[PDB]
Amino acid sequence: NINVDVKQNENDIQVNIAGEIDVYSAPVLREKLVPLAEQGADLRICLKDVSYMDSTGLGVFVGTFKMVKKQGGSLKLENLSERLIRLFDITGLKDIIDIS
């Protein structure tokens, strides 16, 4: 399943995601994190504990990025697998989203 931990402090939000981001758990993730890019803010997403992801998770991550940009925010995704980074590469999204 999936867990999401939001702790907003100082107008900058660290989010840790854990578990599986698939067709079943993606609307839950999108919903919990869709507005924070609708206001725009200083956003940090920790993908340390994601064990599975497909194009459904990639779709929401490009969805949050677009809103942070339309408008007024920052977005970093950090602590990614060697292969989660592989995945963002393979899909033409590595050089348009901040990855760590």
Binding site: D54, S55, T56, I90, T91
Partner: protein, 115 residues
């Protein structure tokens, strides 16, 4: 050898197929990366079927067949159409062969070779 699965076309069950799949893929001795790719590709084919059931508002079912051969795994996902997506890109990049055919909902036939 042919393993067959039939699940309801609901999102809870895609994760189930990934297990069954990693089951087969292990018994055949694929890599971790090779199993981790197979899991993505098969979920993608299943997700199109699950999604296509929302639009029709059908209660549908996905049919999944693993054809385990000496040199390769063959996975067939049928949904008793195709407008290419990010997901279909992922299946092709990660797999050796992908073959798509409609109008049987859609049926996707993908292959991966043992290394």
């Amino acid at each position: 050898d042919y393993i067959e699965m039939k699940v309801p076309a609901q999102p809870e069950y895609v994760g189930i197929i990934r297990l069954t799949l990693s089951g087969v893929a292990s018994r055949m001795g694929y890599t971790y990366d090779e199993i981790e790719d197979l899991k993505i590709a098969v979920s993608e084919a299943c997700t199109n079927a699950v999604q296509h059931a929302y639009k029709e508002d059908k209660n549908g079912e996905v049919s999944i067949r693993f054809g385990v051969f000496e040199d390769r795994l063959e996975v067939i996902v049928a949904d008793e159409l195709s407008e290419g997506g990010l997901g279909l890109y992922l299946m092709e990049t990660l797999m050796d062969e992908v073959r798509v055919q409609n109008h049987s909902g859609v049926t996707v036939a993908m292959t991966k070779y043992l290394n």
